[PDB]
């Protein structure tokens with residue numbers, strides 16, 4: 001297991017524009033196109049992202065290209081974030097994957113509501129961290145996925161991803 005395989009499990013792979021769990025137009029491996037309810041705006045974003053007229057459809061290679069960009073951008077974002085970087089840098093590699101996964105899903109803004117969880121993670125109070133993480137819209141809206149990511153934070157193993 002690694003961050004790619006982990007996020008591939010969590011996000012799936014769809015080659016046509018679809019709506020994510022929040023109802024937002026998305027494609028590939030959880031590549032968010034737009035929060036606009038306007039399908040044409042999503043199609044425009046898609047074309048801009050791929051560099052061709054896609055007509056709402058991409059190939060596996062294109063999906064994986066966006067995915068690489070998105071994962072890298074998530075990591076680079078964490079590193080530029082004065083609140084996230086020290087916590088991220090305190091973690092071992094497996095727990096860092098949980099961190100990237102969470103940021104990938106909810107964005108840096110999405111995190112940030114997680115001040116108390118971040119402090120517990122930096123403290124390596126893993127069970128307490130895991131309890132705090134589950135007290136969230138995140139967990140309640142996507143529990144099966146959040147459970148996996150939380151188990152990864154709690155254990156620093158890939159047990160939840162088999």
Ligand SMILES: CCOc1ccccc1O
Nearest residue numbers: 084087088099114117121
């Ligand atoms: C609670 C979210 O966990 C993290 C997210 C981003 C960077 C480091 C973290 O521990």
